[PDB]
């Protein structure tokens, strides 16, 4: 039961519920998410603040006593997880363009002291004409050191596992894990569940042969600095955005 929404939008098929939406004024297609709670209240507060071309935007929200309505950008290219599956490996020029998108989104979030802490291929949508980061369910504002161990372990930084306290740079660690997966088809820390944790805490970035023989040393160098165990020495999003591989 929308009302003010029906005057501005034309709801279509269905994909909490998700349905296609069409903006009357622009003829642009949008997604409408119908949600029937402090953690949900927190997530929408970030959605209102974050506006970047490499982030899935929240166009508007209507809050009613029974349910909650969100109109958001619709991306038809699917998530990076599915795209990685069919192609397996990407060219260096394609992958650096994606890192440009992800690092741009990360830099913007960190200028707001927001850590996403759920940066994985399923949450990166692909746009035909780009990447967009989404799902801020784990996102938060870094008032101090964080200690909760959340996120899909393959992309989780060693300080999260160590439980000694983490901050904004865990998003950079995930960005290096993704870029690594983009260039060779497999993650830098693999495990066999406990084995995965010792690989991350050791933090040894390797570039096996034959897979990494063609990839340039500029890419290996950047990936190394993104995947540093020393958080202070680990790259910031600005340092990623100024690297020659990204430009
Ligand atoms: C045709 O479009 C798609 C197809 C696939 N398939 C994946 C599976 N294979 C088998 C078939 C293709 C996956 C995603 C999309 N598009 C899409 N566009 C916008 C999203 C969104 N999904 N979802 C699901 C999100 C997923 C991750 C992060 C953010 C969002 C997010 O906030 N929104 C806005 C809202 F949620 F409101 F819909």
Numbering used by the authors: 382 to 396, 402 to 422, 430 to 522, 528 to 590, 594 to 648
From the study:
Doublecortin-like kinase 1 (DCLK1) is a multi-domain bi-functional protein that belongs to the protein kinase superfamily and the doublecortin (DCX) family within the microtubule-associated protein (MAP) superfamily. Doublecortin-like kinase 1 (DCLK1) is an understudied bi-functional kinase with a proven role in tumour growth and development. Multiple isoforms of DCLK1 exist, generated by alternative splicing. Here, we report the crystal structures of DCLK1 kinase domain in complex with DCLK1-IN-1 and its precursors.
